[PDB]
Amino acid sequence: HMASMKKKGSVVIVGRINLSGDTAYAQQTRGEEGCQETSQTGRDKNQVEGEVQIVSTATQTFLATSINGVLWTVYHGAGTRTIASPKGPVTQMYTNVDKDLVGWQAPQGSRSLTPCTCGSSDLYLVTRHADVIPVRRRGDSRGSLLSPRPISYLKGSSGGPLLCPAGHAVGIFRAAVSTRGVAKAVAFIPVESLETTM
Numbered sequence: 529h530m531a532s533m534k535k536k537g538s539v540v541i542v543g544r545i546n547l548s549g550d551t552a553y554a555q556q557t558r559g560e561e562g563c564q565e566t567s568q569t570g571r572d573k574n575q576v577e578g579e580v581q582i583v584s585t586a587t588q589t590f591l592a593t594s595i596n597g598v599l600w601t602v603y604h605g606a607g608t609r610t611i612a613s614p615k616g617p618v619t620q621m622y623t624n625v626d627k628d629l630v631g632w633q634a635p636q637g638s639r640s641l642t643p644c645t646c647g648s649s650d651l652y653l654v655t656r657h658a659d660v661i662p663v664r665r666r667g668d669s670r671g672s673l674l675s676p677r678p679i680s681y682l683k684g685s686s687g688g689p690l691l692c693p694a695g696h697a698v699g700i701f702r703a704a705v706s707t708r709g710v711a712k713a714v715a716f717i718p719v720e721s722l723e724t725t726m
């Protein structure tokens with residue numbers, strides 16, 4: 529009934545991947561109880577830092593990456609949800625189900641990656657566990673892992689970046705190709721497809 533109808537909560541930043549120094553490591557900035565409360569209110573007063581955020585809904589967790597002032601993630605994680613912010617829920621600025629892509633204005637305090645113009649095919653995928661995984665680019669939206677590993681190790685890293693040797697954004701991780709549970713290849717939204725959308 530219309531009186532009964534519920535509202536989905538916001539996406540919430542619950543941590544980050546720290547790439548500041550010589551060692552990449554994940555940091556949690558909010559626990560599950562505070563995450564649930566912030567998803568319901570959409571009001572997140574925590575300080576945001578860095579380029580790759582770990583984000584959560586009530587039911588899923590994944591990554592979001594700032595590139596050129598937009599916090600980008602996957603539609604299959606975020607759907608059409610708002611993101612929590614200090615002043616309340618923020619509506620998506622970009623939504624493209626056909627690319628599995630959404631974006632919001634990048635949160636104050638975040639740092640944005642620069643879009644890659646190198647044309648390099650030697651990429652690096654950053655996971656929610658702060659693994660930096662070498663990936664050879666194999667097409668506009670595909671790359672192969674140099675060291676395959678079970679898909680378990682990639683689960684929850686959609687929305688994370690593929691970076692070039694110079695640390696620029698080449699794309700947003702979207703999906704994995706699984707052969708008997710082993711990830712041999714990944715698919716990603718290329719940064720040019722974000723640059724078009726903008």
Ligand SMILES: COC(=O)NC1(C(=O)N[C@H]2CCCCC/C=C\[C@@H]3C[C@@]3(C(=O)NS(=O)(=O)C3(C)CC3)NC(=O)[C@@H]3C[C@@H](Oc4nc5c(nc4C)CC=C(OC)C5)CN3C2=O)CCCC1
Binds near residue numbers: 588683705715
């Ligand atoms: C043979 O057929 C295929 O396998 N084809 C493909 C393939 O589907 N692979 C699978 C293998 C899964 C097994 C686990 C893979 C591990 C990590 C994955 C990175 C990662 C991830 O981590 N998610 S997550 O953070 O955990 C989560 C779910 C919390 C957000 N994403 C995934 O699971 C995604 C989700 C889904 O894909 C899509 N859903 C949608 C859209 N577009 C895609 C492409 C567009 C519009 C939508 O509206 C709803 C939905 C299946 N996904 C795969 O990756 C592979 C080649 C191209 C597509």
Ligand SMILES: [Zn+2]
Binds near residue numbers: 644646647692696
């Ligand atoms: Zn580059």
